[PDB]
Each structure stands twice: as C-alpha cells, then as structure tokens.
Design a protein around this ligand. Sequence first.
Ligand SMILES: CC(=O)N[C@H]1[C@H]([C@H](O)[C@H](O)CO)O[C@@](OC[C@H]2O[C@@H](O[C@H]3[C@H](O)[C@@H](O)[C@H](O)O[C@@H]3CO)[C@H](O)[C@@H](O)[C@H]2O)(C(=O)O)C[C@@H]1O
Ligand SMILES: [Cl-]
Lengths: 263, 256, 257, 263, 258
Amino acid sequence: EVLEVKTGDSITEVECFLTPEMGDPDEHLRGFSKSISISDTFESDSPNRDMLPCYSVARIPLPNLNEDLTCGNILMWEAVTLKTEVIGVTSLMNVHSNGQATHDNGAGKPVQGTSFHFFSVGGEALELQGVLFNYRTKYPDGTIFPKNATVQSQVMNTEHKAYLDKNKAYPVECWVPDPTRNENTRYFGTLTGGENVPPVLHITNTATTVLLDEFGVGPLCKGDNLYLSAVDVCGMFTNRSGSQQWRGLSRYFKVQLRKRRVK
Amino acid sequence: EVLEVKTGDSITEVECFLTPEMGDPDEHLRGFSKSISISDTFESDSPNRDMLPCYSVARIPLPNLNILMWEAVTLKTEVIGVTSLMNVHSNGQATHDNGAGKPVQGTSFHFFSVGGEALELQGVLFNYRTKYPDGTIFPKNATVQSQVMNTEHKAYLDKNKAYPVECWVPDPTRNENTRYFGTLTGGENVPPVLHITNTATTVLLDEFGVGPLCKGDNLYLSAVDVCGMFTNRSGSQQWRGLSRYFKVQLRKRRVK
Amino acid sequence: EVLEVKTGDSITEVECFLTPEMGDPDEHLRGFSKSISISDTFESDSPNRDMLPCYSVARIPLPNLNNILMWEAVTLKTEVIGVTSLMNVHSNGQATHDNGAGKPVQGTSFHFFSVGGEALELQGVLFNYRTKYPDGTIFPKNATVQSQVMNTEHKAYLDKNKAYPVECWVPDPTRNENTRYFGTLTGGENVPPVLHITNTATTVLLDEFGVGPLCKGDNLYLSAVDVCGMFTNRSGSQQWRGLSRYFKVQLRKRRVK
Amino acid sequence: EVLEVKTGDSITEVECFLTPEMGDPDEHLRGFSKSISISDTFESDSPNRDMLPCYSVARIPLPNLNEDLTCGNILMWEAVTLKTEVIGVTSLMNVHSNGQATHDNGAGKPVQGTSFHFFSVGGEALELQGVLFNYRTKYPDGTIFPKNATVQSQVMNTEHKAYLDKNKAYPVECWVPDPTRNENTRYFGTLTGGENVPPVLHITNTATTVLLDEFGVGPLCKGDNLYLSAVDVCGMFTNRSGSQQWRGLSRYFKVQLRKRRVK
Amino acid sequence: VEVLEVKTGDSITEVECFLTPEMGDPDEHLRGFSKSISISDTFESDSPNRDMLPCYSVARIPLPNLNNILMWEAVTLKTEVIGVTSLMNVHSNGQATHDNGAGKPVQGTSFHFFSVGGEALELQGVLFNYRTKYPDGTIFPKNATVQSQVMNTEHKAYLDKNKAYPVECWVPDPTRNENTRYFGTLTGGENVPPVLHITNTATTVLLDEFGVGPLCKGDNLYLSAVDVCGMFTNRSGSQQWRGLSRYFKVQLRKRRVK
Ligand SMILES: CC(=O)N[C@H]1[C@H]([C@H](O)[C@H](O)CO)O[C@@](OC[C@H]2O[C@@H](O[C@H]3[C@H](O)[C@@H](O)[C@H](O)O[C@@H]3CO)[C@H](O)[C@@H](O)[C@H]2O)(C(=O)O)C[C@@H]1O
Ligand SMILES: [Cl-]
C-alpha cells in the first residue's frame, strides 16, 4: 500500500484561513449568532437557523499529480505538519460596544461562557456521527441534521452518519467526529461548558503539530484535495439588554505536504 | 506463566460504544436521570432507581482460541457527542433576564476500564443509612464503618444498569487483570472540560510488558461519563451522561 | 553506610488502607467532623475534639531480618478510596437554588501521604497561638506569638492515631531524612474536589543516591490525611468529610553497616 | 541562503525595557487607561484614544556589520535566545487606595479581568492583521486602525495589513500578529478573557526561550536593527465609584545574538 | 572573574535555615499578620501605616572561611512553606461564608517568592500609585514621578535589611542579579484559593547555562523570601494579610576562580 517518499518539486505548502459560521443574523453581524431564545417546554425546542453555529470546511486543490498513465502505483500528497491558531483574539478586548456593565459604572462584560475549539486536517471529508441533546428538537430548514431521530439519538444511534461536505450547514450541537471512521483525518477539539468560563487563547508562530500516525504516515489526499475543518465558538457576547449571541473567530492553517508513492 | 507473543492472524481489534446508564426516567429521557430530590434526614435518604446513575459494562466475546489467550495491548477512547452540551435553548433556566439557558455543569465522574475479566468493586457509602432501591445491587449489611471502609462490600461489575456509581469504586486491592482510570470533579458550578482526538493511544501493558489476559476469550469494558447536571426552567436538576467509544488492539500470547 | 541490594526471597509487599480521622461526632457520622462553630475572638478559640481532623498513621511490622539487613521501601501505589460517594447530593444537603440538587462536598482540602522507615517528624505551626486545644489531642505546648510563624520548641513524632490535629502540625522539613512525604493544601470556600483513581501509577521512593526509606526495627510507617472538603447540610452548618487511602509498597532487602 | 556562524567579537547582547501604552488619561495616570465608557448603541461605538491600550515597540541598533565591500556574502546579527519578564508584579498588591471594597469593611478589589500578555523578537517590524469586534466602531484620531472596514472585517478582511512601526498608535483590540507573514519574527501571546479572571504573573532570571526555527536559524537583523514588541494589559483597576481602567506593566528583554554569514 | 575547576574530596558544605515572614505584626498577639487593610479616598491621600505593609525577608548566612582564590558555589536548593495546614483554622474569629456556615479561609492575592545569591538581591522600584506616601521605618523609591508607575531607573536598591523593603514597591531587578537565582509568582484576585504543595523530594538546580551557580562574595550566602498567602477575613469583614515561614536547604561546593 504505502511506499517511499519522493525527494528533490516533491514538497508543497497550503496556507489559508477558515471563517467561522455562527449564524450571521443580519448584514452587520458576521461572526455572531442571533440572540439565544429559550423554548417554553422541553418538547417544543425549535432553534432558528441563524441561532445555530455550524462546522466550517474548506477543500483546497493541490498541484495535480499522475498526469501520465502509471502502472500499479500513483503519487499522493501526504500532510506531514500543521501550524494553526485563532485569528483576532485581541478583538475580545472591546468592552465598550453597548455590552452589559459588570456592575454600576463598570466596563462591558467580555465574551465568555461555553466554547468549542476544533480543527482537523484530512485527505477526504471529516466523517461525522450525530448525537442530540434532545431528540424532539426541531432543527430548521437549511441545516443538515440527524434524520429519523429516536430517544436512542440522545446517547448513540448509529443511523446518524454524515460527511462534513458543506459550509454553513452542519450545526455544531448535532454532530461530532465519528471515532469509528476518520482513518485518513487527524482531528482535535475541546468543549469548555459553563456561563462564566473565561476564554484562554494562545498565539505563536513557533508551535508545530505532526500529523503522522504511529506508522509514520500522514493523511493521503484523494483526488489531490486537502480537507480543512474548524469550529471556534469563543463564548457569548452579552448585550446591554441581557440578550446573548455566540461569537466566533477565524482559524489559520499552514500544512506542509510531501509526495508519497502508493501501490 | 506468560511466554511469547504469537506473530503473523495473531492480532484482532475490538471497536464499540458503551451507552450511559443515568436512570432514564421516561421514554423521552435516555441519557438523563430523574430530577434530584433531597431527604430531610440521613435516616430517610431513599433515592429512586431512576435518580441513580450506574456503571456501564460490556462483555465482548473474542475469536475462540483453544494455551493461547488474547492480550489487550492498546486503547483509544473518547466521549461521544460532547457538542450536544451547547444546546442552551431547550427550556433551561436563563442565567439572567433575557439570557441564554444555563449549560450542563457541576459534579462529573469520567471513568473507563479494560480487563480480561469483570471489574472488581469496593463499596463506600456517603451515608450508611441510605436505602438503595429494588433492582440496584448495593453494599449489604452496611454499618457506620461503611462510610470510610468495610471490607465486606466486594462485588463484580457483572450487570448493566445495576451498580450505582455513588456506592461503588474500583477495588485497588484486586484488579490485577484490569487497567482502570477515573476522575471525580465535585462542585455545583464545575465546567465540563471534554477533549476529543483520534491521535491519542493508552498502552495497557504493566511494568513487565503484560496486558490484560482475556479469560474464556472475553474482553470487559466499563465506563461512567456523568458530565454534570442539566437545570430545567423550574430549577430542578437531572444528571446528563454521554456514550464512550473504545478501540482495543489485542494479540495472541502463549501462557502456562 | 548503605551497601548492596539482595537479589532473588529478597522482596516483600505491604498492602493496606488508612481510615480518615475527621472527629466522628456521633455513632452515625464516621468520616465526618462535628459542625464547625466560630469563636467570637482569637482569645476565645476553643475547638472541641470532635471538630478537629487528625493525621492518620499505621506502623506495619515487616518480616524479621536480624553488618545488618534492612527493608528498603522502593515503590508506592496509592489512591483515595470511595471518590464516587461525593455524588450523593440527595442526603440532607442544602439545595444550591430553589428546587435544585444538594450542594456537594467542596472547599478547603488537604491531601497528604508519607512512607518512612520511622515515624513522620512534625513541626507545630498555629494559626492563632491563643487557641485552646482539647483534652485527648496532642498539640504544640508552651505556645507563644512566635508559634504563629516558627517556634522550634514544637517538635513531635506522628506516633498515635486520632491524636495529632491537622491544623497545628506539618511534616518538619529540617528532619524526615528517612521518610518521603507529599501534600497539597487547596484553600477557599468553593474549591472543587479533583480526585483521580488508577491502578497504573507508581511513585518511586528512591532519593538522588538510589536509596529508599530504611525500616528501623523492621517497621514501615504510613501516614495520610484526606480532608476532601466540607459537607453543607439543609441548615447551612458545615462538617469536614474525609475518605480512606489505599497504600501498596514494594520493599527489598538492603545490606547496611 | 544561510551559511556558517562566525566564532571568536562574534557575539553581542541587547538589554532593555518596553513601557506599556495604556492611554495615560492625565499627568498622574501613566500605566492606566481612561475609565471605560459603554456606547448607547452597538452602531455608535466610538472609543476615545486615551481609553485604548496600544502595542509597544522598540527598534534597537546593533553593532554595524559589513563596513567593507563584500562579494555575494554579508554578515547579519542572528537572535538566538530571549529572557523576558513583566516588571513590577508586586505593585498589584496596592489594594489600599481609591479602590472599591470587595465587601463591607473589606480590602480594595485588585486588578483583575481580561488580560493580554504578548512579546515578539524579530529582524524587522512585526507584521499585523486587523480583526475588529464591531466593524462600525469609530476609531479615534492619533491611532492607526483598519481602514475601509466592512462586515467581513469582523472575521477576516485581508486588506487589513500593517507593520508595528510606531509606539502609542496601534490599538491592541484592532490588531494581531499576521500568521501568514512574520517568517523573520518569533511571537508569543495569551488572551485570558473574563470580568473576574485573576492575574497569574511569574518572575525568574533562570528561564530562556530559544528563537531558532526547525533549521537552527533565528531572526536575522536587516540593517543591523532588532525589533522588540510587547503588550502586558494586566487587567482592570476598579475605582470606589465602580469605574474601571486598564492597568499595564513594563516588559524586560535580554537577547543574545551571533554573527551569521548569508549568501 | 575567570571561573576554573570545582574542588573534589572537604569540598562541600550545606546551609539549612528558615526565614520568618514580615507582614507588619500590628500587636504583640499578631505575628504573621498585617494590620487591617483600609482604603484611602484618592491616590493623592494614600498613606499606608507601616504595620499594614508586608516586607521582603532576608538572611545573610556566613560560610566557612576559604582564603587565585576559592569561592563557595551554590548548586542546589530544597525549599517549602512551613505550616500550610494552619489555614484549616476556620473556627477562630472568622466571617461565616453563609448563615450557620464555617469561617471564610485565607484567600485572595498571594505573592510566593524566594532567591539564593552570592550577594544581596538587587531591587528595582515600581509603584502602583507614585503619590503613595510610604511611612517612616520603610525604605521606598525616592524622588518618585508619574514614570515610577511603569519604569524609573533611579529606583535601585539592595535587599540589605529586614522589616524595611515593602513588597508592593520593589521587585527583583532583571537588569542586574547575575550572581542570584530568583523565582516568584503573583496570584491576584479577591477570592483566589491558596494552592500550597509540600514534599521533601523536590530539588532546584541553581547552575546557569555554563554549569556555574551563585559564587558567594566574602563567603556570605544571601537568602530572600516573601510568602503572603492571602488575606484573613475576621467577623466584621475587615481583612489582614497572612504569611508563613520558608525553609531553605542549599548545597555548596568549592570553586577556584581568578
Ligand atoms: C429534560 C426534561 O424532561 N425536563 C422536564 C422535567 C423532567 O422531565 C423531570 O424533572 C424528570 O424527573 O420535568 C419538569 O416538570 C416536572 C413536573 O412535571 C409535571 O408534568 C407536566 C410535564 O412537565 C409537562 O411537560 C407536560 O406537558 O405536562 C405535565 C402536566 O400534566 C408534573 O405534574 C409535576 O409533578 C412535575 O413532575 C421539571 O421542571 O422538573 C419539566 C422539565 O421541562
Ligand atoms: Cl586557590
């Protein structure tokens, strides 16, 4: 299956940013959701599309390989390393833009509370498994959500399989990486839950993640395409009124790739 | 007596989900407990079965071998559905006027084990006068000494939806043939911190390079993943649990 | 003079649990203290015996040996027993809010363990030198205001159970050459317990010279405190709650002169 | 093309401190911002200059290299190591002046809440990317801010490129290090957000950061100049009235450099 | 100094001692505590009482006389805070956390600091408020200006006296202290929990990147410490700093120098 690395135009780099998809409720609110409203009963949960943060995905074309007929073997791009970080972490220091004061005469409350920080690099679409907080939640038109939901969907219903293959579509609260698949992807995520959780965001151009498995093989890019996926829900912004909106930020990716021969 | 590892047909892998057992108080509430109620005295503590999270267990039959035994070498594991806890809109309690719903938070217990036989348990009671309900398996002949250590309370995790998390722990005096890991984080306001990655492996070999050996060609997987409590609009609180993924690599080992 | 390790009959293991000594104020409350009450002044601080957690200790005899041979402690596995009991939030606790669950055990904790070839050596330090400690405890005597920072008179051995109150004694860092000790104080009213359990973790007890505790008279000394925090009952009154500690120690025969 | 390190006057050291630039609202309040005011609407956000912390920067001249004509080769100073620390951490124990009591008869509230701790060492100016919390924020005269802002500026507008080439000018909340550039700079930053986050400030003269990349090459100093950049927003001070001011501290740098031949 | 070979064989010595804390000691019963903390109405009126100000602790330890000369080189340190369990006294004139509750424990701003040097710790002055009037009996930054709130290079001192150098206006000078190793953490916040570790198993190596430790000038070793653990809240709500002693064990060896 996997043979030697090519040396000597044998390496390439992908550098890009993925924008967040927090719901964008009007022309002025890119990076924010709609304010969160709470259903009157548990069974009537019915979130609007613009209140639901979704997974981000980019498919990046790589230099075309195998332009001439080959015999029993091909080249594939192998993703070897990743640098990543959240872009615009200092924007969360704006505590003066019509937020809710911490106390009388105080500054605005900063973005804080529940966060999900997630990134993946793969040679194909991230494979997802559905899990629902509430199987009677009515998910809205324009989203791709677990179908034929049962009470078992609240813990594990193996019917709920999907590919992260569309932007602004797969709600964060419905889907996770499928650990039974993703052989050709490396994924990393942290959920920090709680209304008062402080954002802790590190930036450096000195940190590298190695994407090689225990056999020294990185993701292999099918069709000369690289799949990047992210979520960076940083917390909620609290308006003067008390209403709360999810706030997301963009994620930087730099991936180094090498040509690998495979049978 | 443990001899050489077979090479070549000599490896297998187990992959599965263990669903949580939080109490499931009605046909809509898989993954949740009944809302929690408080006794007015220690002597009147009588929790209903559907208010008690229990240990999860699966006995997984392996390919029949016979001697040779399956040896568990490595584990990948993670909690499945961590993002579901971002639902802050399903009739929860607003943090403040016009605010979002309070997220799942508070006391958690995250636990998993891999063994070649049932997890061995030791009983310890918060309150020795607690009356545990019909259909649970609980420390019997409890005394005030049961609040710190009573060696009578020995059991095997040999039944699903049976062994309440609050009365049992892994027995550190046994479990020679099991590897176990758990963390209790206590407090009504503790934030869930849940990591997911397909790049993390736990090695199950002891200091002598021997992994759990599967008696009768059976692998035992155990879990608890109490994530915290959900607060309803009324203020009532239910435990919330999530499923745990296990991938175990095994190899054939000659013994005796 | 420490000489060679014996190989081959050369090894033994000790396995046991130490119960917590929290004060046990009645026949139903083993593992709890009395409810905490507060003095009106520093000079009137007068805590009752059943309100003071104490250090736990076991002296464990080893196989008789008699360059001479001595038992050398090399490795320790340890963990808190019954961490999941702290999930009982339905037993006369104070609701965290209207219709809510009981407040779990939380706040000030002390988790400590030591392994030695002789009794743990203690130094007394008092929060308040005017505290009147109760009959049946062993406490710093002839206390002065200097006892609030460092009075070298306050030297003791942890040589008795249910006796040495946690708040007036610490391991003496000027002694304890023949013991290995480890402790964490986490202070504050709302601190969450964080309790880890696993049978895969070992502590090596060898010093920088490759030498472990050497057991005088073939006795091993195990000490512990596991104050996990406070339990708040329906009335708001607070009690210390403790749990037992498991120890497993591997020992080997060492020749000495 | 990087060649061999010169040995033997082949080494030099830079030592200095960067003062913080928090806004300095009067002649007594060096190191503090103006008290924070909250806009009446999200659209009307218009912070005053003395309410905005800015990035700090110093450019340090090194011993002059290449005084004689050379042929195809030059020497450059290469930055190899950094010692850095926040100067004055114990000042935050002043809880006895002009403060708001934590409770009846209690001590003053200490400096706490949102912090940004950042430093960089480079052979040229730090390259910046603009990200705005609110694209309709009116930034004040005397600051250098992202121009021609659009709603996209709330997540990622690639027009917003700058150099940290002026002190007291680039607002912290507008700008981050550009991860798509900065090949010749090493940067490190942490945003800890939240109204009540406690400052955690470590000092030691025993800690060293190595500035070499994966090829053993540090920042190379163009024109024999070293660029140091810092932000140390420690949190907010709370007045008796409840009014809150950012508080910053100075940062110490010690950089060891060696002469490197390059072709 | 040219640093030459280490002596082997009579070539080692050790120093073991404790430094008491200096929190202000406002009466004959309150050793280890400051005076209750009060709040001036303005920066201009900030006039802290001497017994309300914690100070750096220092000990100069004479070593065995040695004298191309030999100097004692500090190689390793074991250190810990003494009496951590004393903070479990929540029954002594404390403010109840809630109705019928236990006393509020020591919590809030802490500073834990220690240093080992072959000469006095070098200090740099930094003022929260340049208009603070430091009291008679303290050694404080002189000729303060508004620049003293960020960096005024005039404010240079030696930690050369006890009960003198207030913690809040002095830090180790990072521009000097070549011949010292220093370590400190400030943990701010009104409600921060103390987290105090003890063990006799932890050693700090004091050698720099060239394998050289502090070299003791005139055969004197300088130990310095601060252990402000947080504040104690009494029944009225008034708050006092509380400190604890620090243990030091330093191993030293003879080093030839020119
Ligand atoms: C997640 C969830 O289900 N939340 C609900 C919660 C839980 O189901 C229980 O607490 C689990 O033990 O129940 C809440 O209501 C408690 C009361 O229910 C009343 O019945 C209602 C029911 O709640 C409605 O949904 C239904 O449409 O109508 C019923 C009225 O006939 C009972 O009569 C009353 O005794 C309580 O049990 C709760 O607040 O605890 C509602 C949560 O949404
Ligand atoms: Cl000499």
